[PDB]
Ligand binder design. Sequence first.
Ligand SMILES: O=C(c1ccc2c(c1)OCO2)N1CCCCCC1
Ligand SMILES: [Cl-]
Ligand SMILES: [Zn+2]
Ligand SMILES: [Zn+2]
Length: 560
Amino acid sequence: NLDIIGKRIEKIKQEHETSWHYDQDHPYKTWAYHGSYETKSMVNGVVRLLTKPWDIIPMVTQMAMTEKVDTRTQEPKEGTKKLMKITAEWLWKELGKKKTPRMCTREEFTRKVRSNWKSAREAVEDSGFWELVDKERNLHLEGKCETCVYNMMIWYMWLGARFLEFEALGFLNEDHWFSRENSLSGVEGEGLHKLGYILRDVSKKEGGAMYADDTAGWDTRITLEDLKNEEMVTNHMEGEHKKLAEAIFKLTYQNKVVRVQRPTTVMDIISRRDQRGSGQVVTYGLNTFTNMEAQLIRQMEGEGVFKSIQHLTVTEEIAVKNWLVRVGRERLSRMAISGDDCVVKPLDDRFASALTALNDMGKVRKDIQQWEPSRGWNDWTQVPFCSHHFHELIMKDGRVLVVPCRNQDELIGRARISQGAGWSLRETACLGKSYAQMWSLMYFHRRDLRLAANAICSAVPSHWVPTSTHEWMTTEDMLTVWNRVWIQENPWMEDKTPVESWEEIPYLGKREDQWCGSLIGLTSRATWAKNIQTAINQVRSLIGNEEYTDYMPSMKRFRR
Ligand SMILES: O=C(c1ccc2c(c1)OCO2)N1CCCCCC1
Ligand SMILES: [Cl-]
Ligand SMILES: [Zn+2]
Ligand SMILES: [Zn+2]
């Protein structure tokens, strides 16, 4: 405990010796309190002016306006712990069959920060920072830590600590350990234009309903035995790397020090050995891994591989092992897993009431009573995954698009928001164009979004570059990007005949469009569409005398 966190806690106190108070009214129960010290959503006008009908839709307008953590997690039973240890060991070996753990480099880290001290870019160019890094590094090589502290305001750490995390664990993301080709259940690097096709291929598999249970506060349900099963990745490493990775796991993940803003204003220095604490990218990879593990074990319970989680017999151990060796890869292929998010098509519907292992691992389902069986989906096109559902859409030439979709109020509401301020008009315009190009590539099938996207791309200078997969982040023609993404590079499309205009590219049915939140039918929407050139001209007049393209004639109704 304090042997590992003391040094860090001692350093912060000395740096604040003129304010160190052991507040006795601290509100912490599950987090260890060590001491305390003294401390102290913007609208995108370009998108909003070109989406006037949505100015009166509360779902859109309210998006721009504005205890689970402090909880414990019962230690799993012995049988649960063994199932998780056996499953983790087997899974790291499978992920490692065609991959080589390796250190990520100051070079790789520098290039990344220079493509998204005052900013981190300045520090990456300052040798003093790398000297501070080297000090902590050599410390980590000793099994000690000084500066690796979680800074809340999602816990931000100091860039150097982030570098050490990347150096030791960045390979999981950088080398695509959770790609579908390597993990079978994963979807890292796939893209929204591929997720629907993946869910459709899972559907193809003989089995029961498709289950998509969300966990309540997954990061808060991350146990120590979870963190120890994740650390077994180090048993595939060698030399300095092994030691470095081991230090990240022991000193920064399995023992954490955090600084929390408390108004009553003071900063509190609290610690904890349990819960997800790491970079949002390492967090994603380890969430995927431990979710894959949990869902394989839930599949084991459904299929009758183990009778009880209280304790595992030796025969039950060999059975779990033979199951993993005989059908584990097939079982992973029945899943789509993105961090804490999952879709499982099990062998049959016994999975729906196989809840003992899942509840005992602490991965308790959200919005359903603890022992109530899961409600599965009979149609892959209604399954939720990564905040979307997926439609099957037949082109006038009989080729099949599987397209991503969500409630259109959510799409329009997000595009109306800019994060951080100090934005020039030009930068606000380039963010608006990023959303419009995304809509043209992923949501072309929604009448209002194709129209609003064309309007935004007409109102913003043709050569301005979209700012902040993301194949929509380019100045290339959007039709040529469409063709590359949906035809040329689409492994589900046998016929590679390119599309010659936007009018070849279909929409959802009018009623389906309305069901997913379209405003077609409304007189507000009809007036908006009819007079769109006037809205386009309002924004052109604000930006000024620049080179503009009219993209509206790409649509049949404006092709006049
Ligand atoms: O016929 C239409 C319709 C109206 C305006 C449109 C449109 C379709 O496409 C572009 O502008 N509706 C609207 C709601 C859907 C069910 C059928 C009725
Ligand atoms: Cl259904
Ligand atoms: Zn450290
Ligand atoms: Zn939809």
